[PDB]
A paper describes a structure:
Additionally, to explore the changes during substrate binding and product release in G6PC1, we determined its cryo-EM structure in the apo state at a resolution of 3.4 Å. Since G6PC1APO represents the ground state, the open state of the ECD in this structure signifies its lowest energy state. To illustrate the details of the substrate-induced conformational changes in G6PC1, we performed a structural alignment between G6PC1APO and G6PC1G6P using TMD as references. The TMD structures are nearly identical (root mean square deviation (RMSD) 0.504 Å over 1290 atoms), whereas the ECD undergo significant conformational changes and displays an ~1.9 Å displacement of the center of mass (COM). According to the comparison, we infer that the binding of G6P attracts nearby residues, causing local conformational changes, which leads to shifts in EL1, EH1, and TM7 toward the active center through extensive interactions within the ECD. Notably, EL2 undergoes dramatic rotation toward the active center, which, together with other changes in ECD, reduces the volume of the substrate-binding pocket from 1651.0 Å3 to 1364.0 Å3. Notably, these interactions are absent in the apo and phosphate-bound states, indicating that they are induced by G6P binding and play important roles in the subsequent hydrolysis process. Consequently, the unrestricted ECD tends to return to its lowest energy state, adopting a conformation positioned further from the membrane.
Human glucose-6-phosphatase catalytic subunit 1 (hG6PC1) is a key enzyme in glucose metabolism, governing the final common step of gluconeogenesis and glycogenolysis, and directly regulating energy homeostasis. G6PC1 catalyzes the conversion of G6P to free glucose, which is then transported to various tissues through the bloodstream, supporting essential physiological functions. G6PC1 contains a transmembrane domain (TMD) composed of nine transmembrane helices and an extracellular domain (ECD) formed by two extracellular helices and two extracellular loops. In this study, we determine the cryo-EM structures of G6PC1 in both the partially open and fully open states, in either the apo form or in complex with the substrates G6P or F6P and the product phosphate.
Residue numbers in the entry: 1 to 141, 147 to 351
Write the structure that this text describes.
């Protein structure tokens, strides 16, 4: 008893055509929305702004982002999901019927399985935390104005992200809906785990080691049964309208090490002695200092992101990417605040 989900697939294709045929003067806006929702905006912009306003929100945001990435990868390995494009030129569902018309944008022609919507899940898991934390903080203040403004803003962001993903013919509506719901779930369930604070340096190492070991073991186990993990490459190549648009990548472990490096860097920065005298110092928590630290961290991280590891060797690429991802939280809470405190020295 198993029947095809071509009903959902055709509903997605018709949704893409409906969105494309009318809003033909909005491709730039949807591209801009799709490029901002990228997760390299919660480790470089959102984190240093929230870590100094209140130290508890930043750690929760970072943990939610890392766990969301890990779950995204692990479940993406084992779901074998299609995409809006690449399914209308291959399936025989429109064999005795008519075939709609789908146009391909350069941002389209993705090369990986798209069962969990990474952009939507990360955006939900990162924005739910911000909204709920702001609502909790602003309790000291007739209250159905700020609440409704914040929730309407959050839902508008989610709807715009989903529409951007559908309009570019990169994910079906159910994929992004499930991704949004899973991100909300992970944020909600991390909102109650209170052992992530004041955690020992040994515990962070054990957690990171467990995540890495489980990922590698799972990756090998699936290869040890007869599961194919490269079906997305040849089919994407054959049904993409231009080979130049395709962005073939040869890194099976690309975001895993980046997330693990971010987690390890946060642990080291939190448990290092230099942070204790820099951000927990004596009479240095007056607000202009925090604002200056935020501005300096943002500027220096933006300048520092403009590097690329050498791809001529794979192991060196992985090691350097891990080190950079570790420096991202190790240089925004530890060294810059201490340098600014010493500047306050003279």
């Amino acid at each position: 008893m198993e029947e095809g989900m071509n009903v959902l697939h055709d509903f997605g294709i018709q949704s893409t055509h409906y969105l494309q045929v009318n809003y033909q003067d909005s491709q730039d806006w949807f591209i801009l929305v799709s490029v901002i929702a990228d997760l390299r905006n919660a480790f470089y912009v959102l984190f240093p702004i929230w870590f100094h306003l209140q130290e508890a929100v930043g750690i929760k945001l970072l943990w939610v982002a890392v766990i969301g990435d890990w779950l995204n990868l692990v479940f993406k390995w084992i779901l074998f999901g299609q995409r809006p494009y690449w399914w209308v030129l291959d399936t025989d569902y429109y064999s005795n019927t008519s075939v709609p018309l789908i146009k391909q944008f350069p941002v389209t022609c993705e090369t990986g399985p798209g069962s969990p919507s990474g952009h939507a899940m990360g955006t939900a898991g990162v924005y739910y935390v911000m909204v709920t934390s702001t609502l909790s903080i602003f309790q000291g203040k007739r209250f159905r104005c700020l609440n409704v403004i914040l929730w309407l803003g959050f839902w508008a962001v989610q709807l715009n992200v989903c529409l951007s993903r559908i309009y570019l013919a990169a994910h079906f509506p159910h994929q992004v809906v499930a991704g949004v719901l899973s991100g909300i779930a992970v944020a909600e369930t991390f909102s109650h785990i209170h052992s992530i604070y004041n955690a020992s340096l040994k515990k962070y190492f054990l957690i990171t080691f467990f995540l890495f070991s489980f990922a590698i073991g799972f990756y090998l186990l699936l290869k040890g049964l007869g599961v194919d993990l490269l079906w997305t490459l040849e089919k994407a190549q054959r049904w993409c309208e231009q080979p130049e648009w395709v962005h073939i990548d040869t890194t099976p472990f690309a975001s895993l090490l980046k997330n693990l490096g971010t987690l390890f860097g946060l642990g080291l920065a939190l448990n290092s002695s230099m942070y204790r005298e820099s951000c927990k110092g004596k009479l240095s928590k007056w607000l202009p200092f925090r604002l200056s630290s935020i501005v300096a961290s943002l500027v220096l991280l933006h300048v520092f992101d403009s590097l690329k590891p050498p791809s001529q060797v794979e192991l060196v690429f992985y090691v350097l990417s891990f080190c950079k991802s570790a420096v991202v939280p190790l240089a925004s809470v530890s060294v810059i605040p201490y340098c600014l405190a010493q500047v306050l020295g003279q």
